[PDB]
Amino acid sequence: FVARSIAADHKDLIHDVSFDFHGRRMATCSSDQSVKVWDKSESGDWHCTASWKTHSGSVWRVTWAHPEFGQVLASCSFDRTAAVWEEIVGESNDKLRGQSHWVKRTTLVDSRTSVTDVKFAPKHMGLMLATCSADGIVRIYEAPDVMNLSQWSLQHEISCKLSCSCISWNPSSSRAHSPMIAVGSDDSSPNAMAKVQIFEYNENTRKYAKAETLMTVTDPVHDIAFAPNLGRSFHILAIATKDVRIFTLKPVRKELTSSGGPTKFEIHIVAQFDNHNSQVWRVSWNITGTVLASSGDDGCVRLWKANYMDNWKCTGILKGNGS
Amino acid sequence: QLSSVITTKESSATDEAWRLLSTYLERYKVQNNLYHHCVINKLLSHGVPLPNWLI
Amino acid sequence: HSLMLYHEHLRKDLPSADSVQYRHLPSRGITQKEQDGLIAFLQLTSTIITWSENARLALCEHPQWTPVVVILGLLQCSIPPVLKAELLKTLAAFGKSPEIAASLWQSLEYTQILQTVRIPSQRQAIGIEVELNEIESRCEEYPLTRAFCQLISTLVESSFPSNLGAGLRPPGFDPYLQFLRDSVFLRFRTRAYRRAAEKWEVAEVVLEVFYKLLRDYEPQLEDFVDQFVELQGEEIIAYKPPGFSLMYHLLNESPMLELALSLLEEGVKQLDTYAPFPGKKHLEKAVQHCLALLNLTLQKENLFMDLLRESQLALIVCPLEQLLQGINPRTKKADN
Numbered sequence: 001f002v003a004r005s006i007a008a009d010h011k012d013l014i015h016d017v018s019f020d021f022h023g024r025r026m027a028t029c030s031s032d033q034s035v036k037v038w039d040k041s042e043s044g045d046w047h048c049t050a051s052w053k054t055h056s057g058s059v060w061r062v063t064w065a066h067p068e069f070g071q072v073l074a075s076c077s078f079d080r081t082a083a084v085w086e087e088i089v090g091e092s093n094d095k096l097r098g099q100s101h102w103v104k105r106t107t108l109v110d111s112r113t114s115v116t117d118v119k120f121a122p123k124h125m126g127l128m129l130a131t132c133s134a135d136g137i138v139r140i141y142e143a144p145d146v147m148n149l150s151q152w153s154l155q156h157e158i159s160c161k162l163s164c165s166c167i168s169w170n171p172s173s174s175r176a177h178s179p180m181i182a183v184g185s186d187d188s189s190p191n192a193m194a195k196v197q198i199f200e201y202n203e204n205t206r207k208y209a210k211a212e213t214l215m216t217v218t219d220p221v222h223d224i225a226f227a228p229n230l231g232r233s234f235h236i237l238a239i240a241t242k243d244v245r246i247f248t249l250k251p252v253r254k255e256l257t258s259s260g261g262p263t264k265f266e267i268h269i270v271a272q273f274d275n276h277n278s279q280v281w282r283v284s285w286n287i288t289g290t291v292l293a294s295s296g297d298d299g300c301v302r303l304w305k306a307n308y309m310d311n312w313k314c315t316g317i318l319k320g321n322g323s
Numbered sequence: 324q325l326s327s328v329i330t331t332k333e334s335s336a337t338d339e340a341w342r343l344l345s346t347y348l349e350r351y352k353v354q355n356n357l358y359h360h361c362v363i364n365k366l367l368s369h370g371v372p373l374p375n376w377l378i
Numbered sequence: 379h380s381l382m383l384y385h386e387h388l389r390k391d392l393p394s395a396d397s398v399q400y401r402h403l404p405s406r407g408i409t410q411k412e413q414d415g416l417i418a419f420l421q422l423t424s425t426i427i428t429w430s431e432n433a434r435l436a437l438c439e440h441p442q443w444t445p446v447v448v449i450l451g452l453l454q455c456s457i458p459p460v461l462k463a464e465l466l467k468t469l470a471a472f473g474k475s476p477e478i479a480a481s482l483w484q485s486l487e488y489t490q491i492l493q494t495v496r497i498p499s500q501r502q503a504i505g506i507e508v509e510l511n512e513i514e515s516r517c518e519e520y521p522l523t524r525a526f527c528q529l530i531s532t533l534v535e536s537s538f539p540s541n542l543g544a545g546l547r548p549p550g551f552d553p554y555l556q557f558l559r560d561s562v563f564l565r566f567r568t569r570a571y572r573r574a575a576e577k578w579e580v581a582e583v584v585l586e587v588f589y590k591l592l593r594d595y596e597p598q599l600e601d602f603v604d605q606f607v608e609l610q611g612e613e614i615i616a617y618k619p620p621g622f623s624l625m626y627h628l629l630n631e632s633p634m635l636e637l638a639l640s641l642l643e644e645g646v647k648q649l650d651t652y653a654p655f656p657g658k659k660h661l662e663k664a665v666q667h668c669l670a671l672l673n674l675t676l677q678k679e680n681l682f683m684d685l686l687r688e689s690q691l692a693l694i695v696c697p698l699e700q701l702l703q704g705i706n707p708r709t710k711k712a713d714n
Binding site for chain 1: 333335338342347375
């Protein structure tokens with residue numbers, strides 16, 4: 001695979017990286033308390049266009065909104081906060097030298113503990129944002145306007161009753177599955193027999209009901225991702241733990257006698273891969289949900305795909321040489 | 324006058340009424356014991372569990 | 379406040395078992411003058427809420443009166459069946475508002491005033507199925523059962539929840555239909571009556587409930603599929619719609635059809651005398667609802683018989699036109 005490279009000049013450990021929706025911009029965040037934005041030229045280069053302090057803690061993620069909401073970023077922190085940022089044309093004030101044209105429009109503060117992950121929602125819901133934290137809660141916020149990004153109503157507190165490490169929204173634009181969010185847990189206790197939990201917005205009760213819990217994931221979880229839906233009658237879910245896992249979640253059709261309750265799933269494991277010989281620290285999907293990537297303590301990003309028989313295998317190993 | 328919220332397609336009149344009641348309990352702070360006491364006594368006499376924001 | 383005090387007092391004198399020795403007379407029963415006063419105020423209350431929508435809501439929504447919960451609580455107490463009848467009529471006049479009716483259906487199912495859940499150790503029934511067969515059937519007077527039929531007769535006009543009884547039993551209406559069919563209707567002719575009219579006052583208020591349940595039911599292909607529901611960890615079939623149950627009992631040689639046709643026989647036989655008799659107006663309505671049931675069956679029969687043919691359900695049913703040409707077991711002719 002052909003590589004270009006960039007010196008990132010973060011003054012401590014980088015914790016995350018994320019692309020814009022077009023792959024024309026990227027964001028990165030660090031223990032130096034900064035976020036940086038880097039933009040891809042009409043010559044094939046990349047340049048650092050903003051590099052500013054975001055928070056008081058170590059920054060644990062960075063994420064973009066969909067561009068029908070313009071140019072908006074979110075970041076989560078060890079100081080127990082999350083923050084929302086807008087890119088503005090022409091505001092940048094020499095009266096306050098060395099501030100960014102990426103302005104903080106709000107700070108969310110309601111988590112009792114470090115905010116471990118943050119994700120914007122599937123755009124068909126609205127301008128919505130989820131965060132999770134080590135108080136064992138996921139929190140969901142809504143902006144009632146797309147311009148007044150200072151104002152965000154906290155609509156849901158979702159109780160995992162185990163610490164939260166990561167979150168994934170379900171990427172179903174199809175109006176035949178209700179809104180869904182999956183949650184992973186860093187909990188090292190032997191008492192909690194499952195470390196992944198799944199919630200469904202149920203119109204009949206108007207709150208995120210706990211539909212399922214993965215009783216085969218006994219082991220701590222570091223990252224979690226639903227696969228983008230090529231029309232499938234079933235969902236696919238990747239998990240990062242002591243090994244890589246790929247689950248299927250196929251909705252059980254309700255009989256016309258099971259009203260008011262959430263849905264339920266015919267659930268399988270399609271794959272479980274030890275091959276990192278080490279823990280797994282991210283899981284992210286290609287745009288069509290046909291290829292998974294995952295990293296570990298083996299210094300390899302490993303690529304995974306279905307063959308024509310839906311037998312999932314490793315297909316590539318991207319690894320450093322140290323020269 | 325709830326005219327300052329874009330219609331997100333996953334709501335209904337039930338919780339925009341809870342939202343209006345929350346906004347009034349935050350808009351009229353000068354006597355706020357009586358209006359929380361009133362609303363909670365009206366919910367509990369009907370057996371209705373109290374929202375996170377109200378508590 | 380008086381109803382809450384009577385509920386609190388009657389519920390405190392419940393007999394803890396271990397006290398087998400010489401009690402005095404318990405000077406805490408409602409006196410007849412308090413019963414007659416409570417009846418007069420329940421009758422005033424029932425007229426007011428029968429007419430004013432705003433008066434049903436602004437009494438049920440009261441934080442401190444909670445009238446449905448207090449009245450259902452008093453129906454669980456050992457109070458006289460006449461006071462229970464005017465309490466049930468007050469619930470029937472409240473149950474005209476569909477918001478009240480939907481919460482009242484859940485409150486009836488929770489209070490087991492009809493026992494819909496039968497425990498396998500329990501050698502004796504509880505609720506109105508005992509008060510009918512051991513109290514009303516000893517007085518030869520039936521005010522409680524008629525007021526219960528009147529309560530169900532209003533609570534059908536606002537519809538009933540499809541999930542009625544879910545998690546406690548299979549969902550649906552059929553336990554109330556079994557009581558009204560097999561413990562009220564099929565027994566209205568084998569009971570004694572101090573009022574010769576009341577035999578017909580009981581027939582009117584049960585055939586009205588069946589008429590409403592068959593009027594507002596329309597056959598669907600779903601009715602002909604067995605829908606399974608998880609109950610305590612076993613998969614159990616749901617109760618079919620009460621109108622499907624009524625169609626099945628009118629499209630077969632059932633004791634309900636025998637009792638309907640032998641009501642049409644007895645109606646003509648009393649009318650061909652042209653005489654006045656006690657309860658005549660109630661027999662004429664009980665015949666009217668009986669004809670209107672058979673007429674609603676004939677209007678829905680073809681659709682019910684086609685959806686049964688498409689669904690492949692292993693039931694047999696006969697056209698009501700053919701069952702009406704069956705030999706009347708009384709006269710020994712096809713004279714229906």
